[PDB]
Design a binder for these strands. Structure first.
Ligand SMILES: [Mg+2]
Ligand SMILES: [Mg+2]
Ligand SMILES: [Mg+2]
Ligand SMILES: [Mg+2]
Ligand SMILES: [Mg+2]
Ligand SMILES: [Mg+2]
Ligand SMILES: [Mg+2]
Ligand SMILES: [Mg+2]
Lengths: 107, 141, 67, 63, 69, 145, 80, 141, 206
RNA sequence: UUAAUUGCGAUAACGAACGAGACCUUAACCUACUAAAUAGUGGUGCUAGCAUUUGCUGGUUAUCCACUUCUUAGAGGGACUAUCGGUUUCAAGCCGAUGGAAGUUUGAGGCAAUAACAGGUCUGUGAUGCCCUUAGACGUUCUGGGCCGCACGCGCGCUACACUGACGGAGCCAGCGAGUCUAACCUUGGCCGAGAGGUCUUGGUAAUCUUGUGAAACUCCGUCGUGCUGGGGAUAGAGCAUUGUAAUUAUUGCUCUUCAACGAGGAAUUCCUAGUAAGCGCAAGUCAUCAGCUUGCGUUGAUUACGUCCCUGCCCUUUGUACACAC
């Protein structure tokens, strides 16, 4: 607890990309003001979920098809953080609709 | 430090990365010599970046090419561009502009695809048809 | 199929009507002028409006343009 | 047969029922100032040198 | 219909006619002659190793052979 | 890998297993004309007989023509692993019988005539000659069977 | 329990929300209000609330076996 | 005169290495060779019955050399092809599992490959040594 | 001319190509002027390519395909009858054999032979159907050089294709004899007979 | 004139609104910013193997350092037919050349006005009016069969009639996906088995592992040699396996075996203008299993034309009408 690193990894995922960008900018923002060594926000390829369905409920008509797209954007940041500093910034003021995962690696 | 430039060349889905450094004329793609590129019917698809400006311009050049994507002949078109682009990029950073321009003029005067990517791209297939434009067969009867 | 619509044409005429001294014969600086003398809700529409504006100015230099 | 040459100098317009025929104004490479109008089938431009097996013939399907 | 088996009275037909042939291949050794395609490929490869006819390009599914010197 | 010259000690057409077999074509694909012998079986029989496959089925000798038939009628004794045969695990005597030229039709006739006597469906459809493997007869097979 | 809790809140400018308006557009007919009067009431309320335009469509059979659609629009609308 | 098995022609090296092991006489052919179609997607046995296993061994030995480590399953897909399914269209199915397994075990006994606990089998020390010798004699003859 | 040394070895036959840009290794486009006039600027010369494979763009402008090299255009017509669509590496192999057959015959340049065969193949006049119905007349017209070279390649390739179909003769062989007969002018090739057939229908429906 | 009621103009019309366009998603470029042990590269703290005086390759990121060119995704930049020439009533425009990643509305889609159709769907809906039935039920469940039945006609398709090929070996390159603790999903590696597949294990809730989905067409080297032939695989028999409680009316896979029609298709008729047609496979959908189907993706990649109203269809103007349920 006496200023010991935890090697935290914060991963952000949601469909609403725009506000996830703000929090990814927020999480990187509160690091240099506390002089925190870090690995930058790594952006991962978007997984375009696709559904191909007929427009018609019945079978009549021209065979027209729709493609629906539920885009999901996943990001992750590696922070070399103290135990205290991470907890009072990630347990509070969580943005709506964006999923966040806090995991620990000790390789 | 070793003077090196890193470039690339792109066909439809084939991309070849070329590392161009000083040396004695080593031309290796996938760890294999440029005389070993396949198929042999298209040996002269990657030979013209060497055979048009002159092989004497490789007496101090080492080219390392790694390629993935595309297909058998998309890769040879991606390979032939990376080497030509890498030679110009190396000659832009360490050689006078006269020599780089004479390479630039020679490649352009022969085939623009030695330096400029083929902008043609695959087109999305549509419902109601096998391809982008083609449609299924209707009958009326 | 490159016939400019009334939105491009009427904005180009209104721009030359009140900003002829500010404008030039170069689209590269004409497009920059458009953002800071007009409100265009997209870059593609600005390039269309500024592009026809430069075409209008090239016609204005050699003889007047009615309207 | 001594077929004569001829150089296309003007594309008058597209003719023909289905529109596949083009009508051109063409002069003669040998004995210049002999300018006549024909009916060409293929894609043609200006300065296209074409051979006429007979020269005493002018286009009839026009306008 | 085709001489799939070579014998002496057919052998002299090859060895006296393969000179002056500008073009030699599997299809011309069955068109001009009567021997089958498989034996024609045998005849071409046989006549190369001694050296009475010359190679221009070695490929499968097609051959290109001419005279010497 | 090399090819050697050969001389024409050729012979006329020939008869094996009460079935005409033409010459002039390679030995493996000549035995395929024998009923119940296919490309795979004739290729196995030749290599068991230890013969050159470039022998055109007409320039062989009587010793190796007698050899191929013995292997063909006696598969198991000549290292044939019993999953290569025409009729496996016979419904009568539980032996693995490879059927030959004149016996393929007779054994097939016996098998269908069995199911007709049995009144089994796969033989019932054979009695009218219809499709016996359940394929749809809606718009297909309007010429035979 | 406690892991999920509701938070009921009020809605500003109800006249600029079709879901709220269409619901009220339905209960008025269930209360017996005239179809034209209810539809003209909704579009007028939406316009006085601050909307640039409104569009009410009532489809189905009314006063006749044959079904017909009625359009009550005001102001400015787009579609594409 | 540095040589590896990448400067030699691909088609020729299997021909040279198979002939060498044909002359070596120690590859312990599994004996069911001359009867197996060497893939369920095949329809006929290999034409060169006496030497097809040696060419297959040469191809497998070359593929362990140029890659990191290859198992049986990757080899089955490697030598597989399109199977003519008759009335139905073509499809891809893997090669024969038993042959691709026993060719690895044959090269295991000669020590061409190691056990490679990180997956399949990787190239062995004495295995890549003799490959370079045949690679050296081919380019220098 | 003078040899050069590199870390990778390079054959001598390919090392000599720097001074003269030829075809594959053998035939040069120098001194291959089209001796028949009225077809130049529509048969492409003086800008050589080593191989007849080029993924160029020739179907975006009206006349851009004229600037396309002649050898490239001939290969493009061998990719016909459905089963051969795509498969351009196969067609490049066919022409390389085809020009080799022309070189073991016909000591003159195969590039000149195919050029001189194009000039002798294109129908100088053609005929179009005029009339609003099926039972109509036919009217004679002269042919633009672009359609002539287009029809010249089509007349050779289809007739050399059905010759090789169901025949022991290979496609490279049928094309090679079709080109040399069309170059000299023999009236025994499919292309020459079709040109005379088309040209004499024009002389009738004039 | 435009793809466009797109505009230039004409003008008893004038100024407008919707639609179209603009817009949005996606593809093409970015050696410019942000960065990355889930992406890659290069030197090497650590190095190792082969051949020789350094090329290829295998591992460690307190058993290392540096970076973003390639990959990714955020902010953005960029194209507006830019420049020039020609033509046009010298207008909107159009055409050609140059440059450029891009000059076909830059390619392709998403959305899409008014007015309608007695178009389809009550067999998607716990959406529903009315009528019928409701205990021997037209409710629901269970057993088995049928939807697949075969003198015949028609449509969408798959495999072919072969050498530009079949087969054998070898070389061997994509992209869009999906995927299990809410228990068997993707399955690697080892073993067995001809094969199908069985078995012992490993990894992956996934840019990590299946998976570099080492796909097919393709390329080379050979066998075949114009022979309904080693083309073609329809029909039919025996057996070995998988899925399922259940395979018979053969789910399917594999092995051997019979090698039918078909020798390029009449009358007629479909789709298509550049990464397009066509060939070739792959993924996903349905799914316990089964694709010859569909939706997408990538591989190889043409011919021809940049046009017209000849046919067909649609729209508009003029005209005729005894039609308006509208020939
Ligand atoms: Mg609008
Ligand atoms: Mg408008
Ligand atoms: Mg049914
Ligand atoms: Mg990949
Ligand atoms: Mg077959
Ligand atoms: Mg047969
Ligand atoms: Mg279906
Ligand atoms: Mg009247």
């Amino acid at each position: 607890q006496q200023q010991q690193i935890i090697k935290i990894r914060i991963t952000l995922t949601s469909t609403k990309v725009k506000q996830l960008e703000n929090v990814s900018s927020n999480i990187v923002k509160n690091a240099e003001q506390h002089n925190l060594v870090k690995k930058g926000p790594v952006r991962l390829p978007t997984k375009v979920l696709k559904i191909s369905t007929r427009k018609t409920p019945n079978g009549e008509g021209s065979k027209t098809w729709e493609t629906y797209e539920m885009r999901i954007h996943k990001r992750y940041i590696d922070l070399e953080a103290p135990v205290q500093i991470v907890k009072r910034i990630t347990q509070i003021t969580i943005e709506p609709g964006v999923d966040v995962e806090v995991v620990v690696a000790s390789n | 430090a070793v003077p090196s430039v890193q470039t690339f060349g792109k066909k439809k889905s084939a991309t070849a990365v070329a590392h161009v450094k000083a040396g004695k004329g080593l031309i290796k793609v996938n760890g294999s010599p440029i005389t070993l590129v396949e198929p042999e019917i298209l040996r002269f698809k990657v030979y013209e970046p060497l055979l048009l400006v002159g092989l004497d311009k490789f007496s101090n050049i080492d080219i390392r090419v790694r390629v993935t994507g595309g297909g058998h002949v998309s890769q040879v078109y991606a390979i032939r561009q990376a080497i030509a682009k890498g030679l110009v990029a190396y000659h832009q950073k360490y050689v006078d502009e006269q020599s780089k321009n004479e390479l630039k003029k020679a490649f352009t005067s022969y085939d623009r695809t030695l330096l400029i990517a083929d902008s043609r791209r695959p087109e999305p297939k549509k419902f109601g048809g096998k391809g982008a434009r083609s449609r299924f067969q209707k009958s009326y009867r | 199929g490159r016939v400019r619509t009334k939105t491009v044409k009427r904005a180009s005429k209104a721009l030359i009507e009140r900003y002829y001294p500010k404008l030039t014969l170069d689209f590269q600086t004409n497009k920059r002028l458009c953002d800071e003398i007009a409100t265009i809700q997209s870059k593609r529409l600005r390039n269309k409006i500024a592009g026809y504006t430069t075409h209008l100015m090239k016609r204005i230099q050699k003889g007047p343009v009615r309207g | 047969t001594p077929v004569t040459l001829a150089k296309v100098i003007k594309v008058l317009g597209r003719t023909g029922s289905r529109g596949g025929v083009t009508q051109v104004r063409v002069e003669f490479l040998e004995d210049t100032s002999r300018t006549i109008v024909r009916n060409v089938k293929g894609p043609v431009r200006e300065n296209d040198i074409l051979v006429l097996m007979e020269s005493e013939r002018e286009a009839r399907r026009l306008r | 219909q085709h001489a799939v088996i070579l014998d002496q009275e057919k052998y002299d037909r090859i060895l006296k006619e393969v000179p002056t042939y500008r073009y030699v291949s599997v299809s011309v050794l069955v068109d001009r002659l009567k021997i089958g395609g498989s034996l024609a490929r045998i005849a071409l490869r046989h006549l190369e190793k001694e050296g009475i006819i010359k190679p221009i390009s070695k490929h499968s599914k097609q051959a290109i052979y001419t005279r010497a010197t | 890998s090399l090819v050697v010259q050969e001389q024409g000690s050729f012979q006329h057409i020939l008869r094996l297993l009460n079935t005409n077999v033409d010459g002039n074509i390679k030995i493996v694909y000549a035995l395929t004309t024998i009923k119940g012998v296919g490309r795979r079986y004739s290729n196995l029989v030749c290599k068991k007989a230890d013969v050159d496959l470039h022998k055109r089925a007409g320039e062989l000798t009587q010793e190796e023509l007698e050899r191929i038939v013995q292997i063909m009628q006696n598969p198991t004794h000549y290292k044939i692993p019993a999953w290569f045969l025409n009729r496996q695990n016979d419904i009568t005597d539980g032996k693995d019988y490879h059927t030959l030229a004149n016996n393929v039709e007779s054994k097939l006739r016996d098998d269908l005539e069995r199911l007709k006597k049995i009144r089994a469906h796969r033989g019932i459809r054979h009695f009218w000659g219809l499709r016996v493997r359940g394929q749809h007869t809606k718009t297909t097979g309007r010429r035979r069977a | 329990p406690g892991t999920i809790v509701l938070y009921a809140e009020r809605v500003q400018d109800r006249g600029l929300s079709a879901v709220a308006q269409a619901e009220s557009m339905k209960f008025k007919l269930l209360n017996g209000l005239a179809i034209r009067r209810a539809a003209y009431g909704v579009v007028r309320y939406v316009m006085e609330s601050g909307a640039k335009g409104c569009e009410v469509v009532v489809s189905g059979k009314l006063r006749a076996a044959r079904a017909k659609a009625m359009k009550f629009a005001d102001g400015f609308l787009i579609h594409s | 005169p540095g040589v590896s098995v990448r400067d030699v022609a691909a088609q020729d090296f299997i021909n040279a290495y198979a002939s060498f092991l044909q002359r070596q006489g120690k590859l312990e052919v599994p004996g069911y060779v001359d009867i197996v179609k060497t893939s369920s997607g095949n329809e006929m046995p290999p034409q060169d019955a006496e030497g097809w296993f040696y060419k297959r061994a040469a191809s497998v030995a070359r593929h362990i050399y140029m890659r990191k480590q290859v198992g049986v399953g990757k080899l089955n897909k490697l030598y597989g092809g399109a199977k003519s399914r008759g009335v139905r269209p073509y499809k891809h199915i893997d090669a024969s599992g038993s042959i691709n397994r026993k060719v690895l075990q044959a090269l295991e006994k000669i020590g061409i490959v190691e056990i490679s606990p990180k997956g399949g089998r990787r190239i062995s020390e004495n295995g890549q040594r003799d490959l370079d010798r045949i690679a050296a004699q081919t380019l220098e003859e | 001319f003078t040899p050069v040394v590199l870390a990778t070895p390079i054959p001598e036959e390919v090392q000599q190509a720097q001074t003269e840009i030829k075809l594959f290794n053998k035939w040069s486009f120098e001194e291959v002027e089209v001796k028949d006039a009225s077809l130049v600027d529509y048969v492409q010369v003086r800008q050589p390519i080593f191989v007849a494979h080029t993924a160029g763009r020739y179907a975006n402008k009206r006349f851009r395909k004229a600037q396309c090299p002649i050898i490239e255009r001939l290969t493009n017509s061998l990719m016909m009858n459905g089963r051969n669509n795509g498969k351009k590496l196969k067609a490049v192999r066919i022409i390389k054999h085809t020009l080799d057959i022309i070189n073991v015959l016909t000591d003159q340049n195969p590039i000149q032979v195919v050029v001189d065969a194009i000039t002798n193949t294109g129908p100088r006049e053609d005929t179009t159907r005029v009339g609003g119905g099926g039972a109509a007349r036919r009217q004679a017209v002269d042919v633009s050089p672009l359609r002539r070279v287009n029809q010249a390649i089509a007349l050779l390739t289809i007739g050399a294709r059905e010759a090789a179909f169901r025949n022991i003769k290979t496609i490279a062989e049928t094309l090679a004899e079709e080109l040399i007969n069309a170059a000299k002018g023999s009236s025994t090739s499919y292309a020459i007979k079709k040109k005379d057939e088309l040209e004499r229908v024009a002389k009738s429906n004039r």
